[PDB]
Amino acid sequence: DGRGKATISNDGATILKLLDVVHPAAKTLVDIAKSQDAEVGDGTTSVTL
Amino acid sequence: GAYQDRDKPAQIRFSNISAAKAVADAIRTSLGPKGMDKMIQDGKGDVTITNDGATILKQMQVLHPAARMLVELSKAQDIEAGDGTTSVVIIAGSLLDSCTKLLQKGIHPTIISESFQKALEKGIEILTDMSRPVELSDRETLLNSATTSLNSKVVSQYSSLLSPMSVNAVMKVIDPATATSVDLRDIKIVKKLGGTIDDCELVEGLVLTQKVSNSGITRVEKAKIGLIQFCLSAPKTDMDNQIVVSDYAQMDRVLREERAYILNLVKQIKKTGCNVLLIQKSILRDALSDLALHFLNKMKIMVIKDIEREDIEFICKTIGTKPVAHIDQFTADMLGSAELAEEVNLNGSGKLLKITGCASPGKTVTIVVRGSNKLVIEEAERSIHDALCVIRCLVKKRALIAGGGAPEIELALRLTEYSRTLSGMESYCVRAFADAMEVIPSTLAENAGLNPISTVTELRNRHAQGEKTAGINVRKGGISNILEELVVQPLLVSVSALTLATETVRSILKIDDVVNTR
Amino acid sequence: VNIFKAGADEERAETARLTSFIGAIAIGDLVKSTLGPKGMDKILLSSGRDASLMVTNDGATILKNIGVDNPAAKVLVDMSRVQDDEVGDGTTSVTVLAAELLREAESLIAKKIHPQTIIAGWREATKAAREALLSSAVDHGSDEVKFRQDLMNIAGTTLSSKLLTHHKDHFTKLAVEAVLRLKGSGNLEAIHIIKKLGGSLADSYLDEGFLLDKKIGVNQPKRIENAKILIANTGMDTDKIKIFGSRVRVDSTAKVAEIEHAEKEKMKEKVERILKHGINCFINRQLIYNYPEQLFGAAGVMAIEHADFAGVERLALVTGGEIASTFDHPELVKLGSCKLIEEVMIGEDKLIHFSGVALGEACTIVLRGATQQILDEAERSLHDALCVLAQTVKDSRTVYGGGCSEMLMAHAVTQLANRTPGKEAVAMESYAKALRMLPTIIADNAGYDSADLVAQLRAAHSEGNTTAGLDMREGTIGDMAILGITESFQVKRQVLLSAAEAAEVILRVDNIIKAAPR
Amino acid sequence: VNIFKAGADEERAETARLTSFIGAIAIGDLVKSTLGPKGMDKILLSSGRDASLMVTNDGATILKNIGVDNPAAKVLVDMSRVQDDEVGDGTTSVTVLAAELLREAESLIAKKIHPQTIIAGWREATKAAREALLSSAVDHGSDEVKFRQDLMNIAGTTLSSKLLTHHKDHFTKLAVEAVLRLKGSGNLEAIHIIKKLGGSLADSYL
Amino acid sequence: LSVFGDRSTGETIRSQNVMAAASIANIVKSSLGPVGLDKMLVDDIGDVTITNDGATILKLLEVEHPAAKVLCELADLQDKEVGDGTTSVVIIAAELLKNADELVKQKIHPTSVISGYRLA
Amino acid sequence: PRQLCDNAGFDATNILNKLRARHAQGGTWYGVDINNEDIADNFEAFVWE
Amino acid sequence: YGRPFLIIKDQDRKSRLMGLEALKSHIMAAKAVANTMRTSLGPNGLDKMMVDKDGDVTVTNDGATILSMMDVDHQIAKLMVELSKSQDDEIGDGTTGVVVLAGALLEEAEQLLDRGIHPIRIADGYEQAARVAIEHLDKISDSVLVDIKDTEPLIQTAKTTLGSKVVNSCHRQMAEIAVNAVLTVADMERRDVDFELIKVEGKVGGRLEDTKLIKGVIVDKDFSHPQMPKKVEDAKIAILTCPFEPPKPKTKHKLDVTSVEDYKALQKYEKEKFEEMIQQIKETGANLAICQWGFDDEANHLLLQNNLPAVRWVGGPEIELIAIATGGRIVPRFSELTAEKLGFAGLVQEISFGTTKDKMLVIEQCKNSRAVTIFIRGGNKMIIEEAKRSLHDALCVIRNLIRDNRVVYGGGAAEISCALAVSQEADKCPTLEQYAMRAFADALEVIPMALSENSGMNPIQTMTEVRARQVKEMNPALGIDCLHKGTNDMKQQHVIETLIGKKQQISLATQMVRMILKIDDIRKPGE
Amino acid sequence: SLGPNGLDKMMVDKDGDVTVTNDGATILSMMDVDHQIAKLMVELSKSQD
């Protein structure tokens, strides 16, 4: 973060949550990850692709 | 034991190594049949594409000193070979990588160099052993050598056409007998924007980028050529001169007489029977007169002004026609003759002068470049130029080696056991030294996208009895007989590369500090 | 109270002392690494010159290009430069030696003895030393065997410090033969030192004759045998005129027309005057117009123009020809004669070969190698290496190096330190001890344990083995006469003398004052 | 490649040694002048405290009041403050002694012997010296006449470095009587020190 | 490690060049075919220029990216060669670039791409 | 799978060309093996989702 | 089409490095940390000095402290920083080299990357190599379970663990100091020990040898009243929380005095209460009292009035240290205290430890006590601080030894056999993990080279001989003659180390470097 | 700076040039004073020398 607290991640949804998007349509993609992460987890990775 | 107080040198050394490795690894991408050309935009704003590393490096605005020597290093390799500038640097850096390896291995750098001095002596010996002596007259092997050089840059597009153009040109300019080191500048390159790289041309004759001065004379048959140095205008002395007018008949007498002077001038020229005029720059003073052109065009004589003093030897080397600087000397005895000469019309209107056929065949020759991209034309000739260079390099030594990294893996293999033979810490250095050569084949499979470690070791494993002829194939994407793939390079190429690197890194080791200056 | 303008300084005798010493110590320790047969070499880079940078081993150049503000240091930098113009290397030694003086002298400042004494005793101490050195010199006159034998011994000693050290034997002959070619003339300018990239360092050599880096004229003979040579400074391209600047004023163009012609005849006959010498080779430092050259070409006589005075010196030296003018009395002027002139191509350029030369007076060394800086510093190495070499001819007396002799001096002072009794004896100790530090530094950069060796080396000299020296390839005491580790007496004399003075001035000051910089 | 935050440093084993060493030497030579029966004293002034200033001979106070950046020197300042807690003066001696220890140690670095060995010999060299030092000790138990006679002698030795030296005899009795007042109690807080202007130094008394 | 500039490699510039090319296509994609609609440029001060021919359009347009100039350079030669196809030609190349990169965009070897492209 | 072979650095096309072809008839659960770098019944390989 | 667009705010200042270039970049950073730490290992090693932001300084050899003090900016470095912190509180020293293990592995790891080799396998093999190491290591591991009452295996181990620290001046004593300390406070029935039972106490002054563990507790408090006698022989002890004042019910409470007699009785009670508890303690038969909280100056004298010294304003943890060391209890009330709850000890005496300072109080308890303190004296504050950590760490390994009584002679022999043990497998490896094997094995080799380099000897001439002997002989007891003793039998040299120390160490390292290999891309915000 | 046992000075010129000497006039000659009476001494010695 801009705070300096580093954060590693393998789950993209987590990475995406870190990746503070400014484009709107992309945030939808980011939202999907949360849903799928709230549903089933990794492959959220895939879900984006 | 002895204690080391200072570490400023060691770290300073490491700094250079890290720089060098970074540099070589950056260049590493571009090499070999799978080499990938790069592009730079100048701070002044110029843009360049390039596949040859030397030109990359001469484009490189390197801040750190060490690679600047490496940059300098390649230029000598370029002034020596032309490709492997690609290969040589990755060799250079790879050495330092292992040279780094030995550094925390605590071995004093001095012994390393001598070990490397020994290490090179074996290799140059080995390379002599493996090479293939070949007389110069075998056109195809030259051709085999050619495309081997050529299938490293973009010109691979029309390689099959480009390679013969190159070799034939060499044959026409060389003496196939003395086996000397004939200069390339006797070969002319013509960067003509537009056209197709396929439409790049050889000229067994003379071509001048400049344009005619006659409106009406365009093509000439059985041309008798004349190259003149002394200007054709109002006679103006080196020292101060001036016509003084104080009387009546001065006007026309002056007025008439200049033309008369000009008239006899042209009159003698026509009296000589020449029909094509060559005029140099006379920027110090008057050039050809407009009036004379009126006469010469009235005399219906082909004419060209503004000929560069630098080209004049080449042209008379080309046309076999000594120039003239005084009227009396201007004589048909010196008058050159050509079967035909004229100005071609390309680029829609990018018009160019051609002179085909000369009764006196000069050894020199010119080369035409056509093609769409302006930058691609420049890169093409670079590839063409180096194509000439390697041939000349091959002209230097009638010995041949397969390209495609096989010599290197042989060497490291051959070094591997000889290192085993040699005792002392030097073995590790040579052990490392051989491991440096290990990089290049690995690079190939990288640019081949193939499993390098599996391949190259298998390349070693085969090469334990799969000697220099065999190696990794690009086209099939495996390991095969490279000789049977007709991918062959002259001995000196890697020799120069190997030799040049060796001295430099030795000089690299002797460094201990850099002091910022005024 | 404020006295000077702002930006002006006044440091009195403690701050003044220290800062003078601090930078001096910085000067020494910055450069100690570079001398010693196992020494290093430094890299110097421009602030901004597109990184005009120089790897350098010779401290003088290292001193030359470093910008230092410590005025006392600038004294030393100039001090070495004098020595550099004296002997070239040992700038390495001299400066660092003078430093330990300063470092150790400062210790006695802590001992708080009036420096006026320090001047006296060292001056006395020096007086013994130089005499002691003088007592140790060795001559070799008509003993050409041993003379030439030792002569090469001197070179390698000087040479076994620079990057070329791996090929000492090679260049030893080079410098030897070239220096002998000077026939007792000391003019290094009689040797040109041509550098060009390409080739290994080992490939560099000295021609049997002479070479030139200029262009042939129009299609004159490229190769000439049993050549008759002429040299002039009379300009041709700059048409010979009458300096005052007379006008030429004429009513009619006919008058100027014939005058242009008249100049032509004036020009033409001048050549025929040249030709009356029956000479097939002519040269000039002037640029020469092509029209006379055509007359020379009309003669089938080759000539080269515009080769600067220095080479002209070389040519006259190598060929015995007398550079001339107006050529009025061919019998009163001696031409130059050589067996052969031919055009040979090196690296990328054709160079002008002079085979079978009349006089070996002039010479030129081929430099093939790896790096501009490598070639540059290799150049730097030899010029000094010749520089000592000529003085060796100039003064054919020698001393053994390898630190031993310096120890002999120190021991001699060590004895006279006792005949002193007084405060000076301490300075006697100081002075002698400082000298002993030098070989210690050499043993330092060789990485062997200095401490015992100097102590042992002191023992044998204190015993009296004046020839026992130091091993640089194994690190121990040894017989320099067996090992030929010798150098010019004059060198180390200036070494001692200059540092002694350098010591004097640095101590005598007790206040620095800087004006406000503009 | 940059690693730390801006304004952070990393000096290794030449720069680290160098700057460390000069500071210690500066510290020593800053304090050498003050010791000795013919010793001198310095002035230390607050930057601004209405110029709270103290002319001083006892270096620990001088060491206390100096702001130093060299941490090794800052190490040394800690060193003396302990010593002042113990014996008060000789901080003088300790301070300069270590620096010259250091200065010469640098010469061994100039002599280029590994510091680890440099440690070993000194530790051993320390070990014997104190042993010999102890062997040189001289006790004085019940020998009150010599004891008291020696007792005053120690003070004057200590006293013959501060400004009271021109009156070493006077205060000699002062503290001697003062100390004899303690009946073996080690609590100096039992002694009060009233100070007030007026009168000569000799006029000061118990 | 170069002063006064970094570098970009691999997909980054690869993708970047595609964006450059496609943009130029989108610059002129509306000026072609019997229904082509002409382009026009307010210069900087009102000396405008309506035109549908790309070579003029490209020539009159400031460009900074290299490869775009190449197409910009390329068209003029065709202008020096044909006169139209300015309706077409540049659109062809970048599209030929477009799909070509896409194969590369997975892994595909460019020189492998070239040969068939040459064959094409 | 294409991403996999990229993240495995494999010639996914040849694998894919093998993949689809072998997936014409020969068995449903054939799929990428990282270590064998090619097709396998990941199901019997217990790659189960 | 082509035109600028925003995906993340500050997209300009969102820099990003990906893949191999980032990979090596981290490797470059890693080596710096490695080269930062190399000198810090071993008896011949040399320790570092850190400078605090508030201008303070610290010299130390414990790399955990070194990094804890270190302020980096590179993120991976912080991972290394906490990494060592994770190792230290896990085991202790060895941190002297823990990171050095990692980066050299990473340094050579890049060599595989320079061979284009994918990190995932590189992650794979090294872990397998790690498992290889431990099962080899514990096989050749010695044990001190087989030992009798472990008096001087530990002393050697303590001696070993202190040879890396500057307190090595008299470390033999401190080796004894700790071992007594730990054995007293250990629960063999548990294989654990709480460090709270240990009271570190270092006061500057005196020599290092003046450092002295105290079978008891020392108090940084003097007497409640100055006239109270400094020494006390008997140790009938009272441990109190309720400060010696009128009790006040902490619910909002207040009295509402009205009449004269209202004033007097309270005034009467005011003293009467003090006599009560003064009587109360007196009836308990204690000899000494101690209170956590305040006193009234009045009853204090009254408490002095009955020759019952007490201590006021005693910090919490210590009071129980007093209580348990005395075996004593903590009573909050005057009435409810009885003699049974009273503490007893051997001796209590305040010490005027400082020549010019206020004093300290020590309790020389003479019975058994599960808590104990160590008193440190010495010449420098940082020297105290170095000692504490060094002393603190030495405790842990013995505690660590308590958990596992099987150790190995240190000095570099241990892992040396492993790489050889690793290497022997590398022939039966098969493929590219085969390269992975020798890589890590080659990676492991550095630690002895660190030693001998810090020993100033030829690192390689040393270990090459060292291997061959451990190649020629089967004894895995030949390390580095660190103190220049011609015997490589470190077992006889007694340089020993717990199995776990290395065992956790490298095992820890493997997982970290696995993540280190695991990452490729970073998006750094512009500062 | 006076006398055989005297000890002399080193001056630094505005343009970075240096000079070591004992001649007091020259000493004052290189000196850049600002105080007026000081200049009188400078010329004083100069006139004297």
From Swiss-Prot, chain A:
ATP binds at residues 43, 46. ADP binds at residues 43-46. The modification N6-acetyllysine is found at residue 17. It is found in: Cytoplasm. Mg(2+) binds at residue 42. Component of the chaperonin-containing T-complex (TRiC), a molecular chaperone complex that assists the folding of actin, tubulin and other proteins upon ATP hydrolysis. The TRiC complex mediates the folding of WRAP53/TCAB1, thereby regulating telomere maintenance. Component of the chaperonin-containing T-complex (TRiC), a hexadecamer composed of two identical back-to-back stacked rings enclosing a protein folding chamber. Each ring is made up of eight different subunits: TCP1/CCT1, CCT2, CCT3, CCT4, CCT5, CCT6A/CCT6, CCT7, CCT8. Interacts with PACRG. Interacts with DLEC1. It is linked to De novo genetic variants in nearly every subunit of the TRiC complex, including CCT7, have been found in individuals with a broad spectrum of brain malformations, and clinical phenotypes ranging from mild to severe epilepsy, developmental delay, intellectual disability, ataxia, and other features of cerebral malfunction. Belongs to the TCP-1 chaperonin family. This is T-complex protein 1 subunit eta. It comes from Homo sapiens (Human). The gene is CCT7.
UniProtKB/Swiss-Prot annotation, chain B:
ATP binds at residues 32, 84-85, 153. It is an enzyme of class 3 (hydrolase). One of its GO terms (biological process) is protein folding. Its EC number is 3.6.1.-. ADP binds at residues 32, 84-87, 151-153, 404, 489. Keywords: Acetylation, ATP-binding, Cell projection, Chaperone, Cytoplasm, Cytoskeleton, Hydrolase, Methylation, Nucleotide-binding, Phosphoprotein. Mg(2+) binds at residue 83. The modification Phosphoserine is found at residues 15, 163, 181, 423. GO terms for cellular component: cell body; cell projection; centrosome; chaperonin-containing T-complex; cytosol; extracellular exosome; melanosome; microtubule. SUPFAM superfamilies: GroEL apical domain-like, GroEL equatorial domain-like, GroEL-intermediate domain like. The modification N6-acetyllysine is found at residues 267, 281, 298, 305. GO terms for molecular function: ATP binding; ATP hydrolysis activity; ATP-dependent protein folding chaperone; protein folding chaperone; RNA binding; unfolded protein binding. Its main location: cytoplasm. It is found in: Cytoplasm; Melanosome; Cytoplasm, Cytoskeleton, Microtubule organizing center, Centrosome; Cytoplasm, Cytoskeleton, Cilium basal body. It catalyses: ATP + H2O = ADP + phosphate + H(+). Component of the chaperonin-containing T-complex (TRiC), a hexadecamer composed of two identical back-to-back stacked rings enclosing a protein folding chamber. Each ring is made up of eight different subunits: TCP1/CCT1, CCT2, CCT3, CCT4, CCT5, CCT6A/CCT6, CCT7, CCT8. Interacts with PACRG. Interacts with DNAAF4. Interacts with DLEC1. Belongs to the TCP-1 chaperonin family. This is T-complex protein 1 subunit delta. It comes from Homo sapiens (Human).
From Swiss-Prot, chain E:
The keyword Hydrolase applies. The keyword Manganese does not apply. It is found in: Cytoplasm, Cytosol; Cytoplasm, Cytoskeleton, Microtubule organizing center, Centrosome. Keywords: Acetylation, ATP-binding, Chaperone, Cytoplasm, Cytoskeleton, Disease variant, Epilepsy, Hydrolase, Intellectual disability, Nucleotide-binding, Phosphoprotein. Its main location: cytoplasm. ADP binds at residues 33, 85-88. GO terms for molecular function: ATP binding; ATP hydrolysis activity; ATP-dependent protein folding chaperone; protein folding chaperone; RNA binding; ubiquitin protein ligase binding; unfolded protein binding. It comes from the Eukaryota. One of its GO terms (biological process) is positive regulation of protein localization to Cajal body. Component of the chaperonin-containing T-complex (TRiC), a hexadecamer composed of two identical back-to-back stacked rings enclosing a protein folding chamber. Each ring is made up of eight different subunits: TCP1/CCT1, CCT2, CCT3, CCT4, CCT5, CCT6A/CCT6, CCT7, CCT8. Interacts with PACRG. Interacts with GBA1. Interacts with DLEC1. This is T-complex protein 1 subunit alpha. It comes from Homo sapiens. The lineage of its organism: Eukaryota, Metazoa, Chordata, Craniata, Vertebrata. The gene is TCP1. The chain holds residues 5 to 124 of 556 of the full protein.
From Swiss-Prot, chain G:
Ubiquitinated by the DCX(DCAF12) complex specifically recognizes the diglutamate (Glu-Glu) at the C-terminus, leading to its degradation. It is found in: Cytoplasm; Cytoplasm, Cytoskeleton, Microtubule organizing center, Centrosome. It catalyses: ATP + H2O = ADP + phosphate + H(+). GO terms for biological process: binding of sperm to zona pellucida; chaperone mediated protein folding independent of cofactor; chaperone-mediated protein folding; positive regulation of protein localization to Cajal body; positive regulation of telomerase RNA localization to Cajal body; positive regulation of telomere maintenance via telomerase; protein folding; protein stabilization. Its EC number is 3.6.1.-. PROSITE patterns: TCP1_1, TCP1_2, TCP1_3. Its main location: cytoplasm. ATP binds at residues 42, 95-96, 411. The modification Phosphoserine is found at residues 15, 335. One of its GO terms (cellular component) is extracellular exosome. Induction: Down-regulated in response to enterovirus 71 (EV71) infection (at protein level). It is an enzyme of class 3 (hydrolase). Mg(2+) binds at residue 93. Component of the chaperonin-containing T-complex (TRiC), a molecular chaperone complex that assists the folding of actin, tubulin and other proteins upon ATP hydrolysis. The TRiC complex mediates the folding of WRAP53/TCAB1, thereby regulating telomere maintenance. As part of the TRiC complex may play a role in the assembly of BBSome, a complex involved in ciliogenesis regulating transports vesicles to the cilia. Belongs to the TCP-1 chaperonin family. PANTHER family: CHAPERONIN.
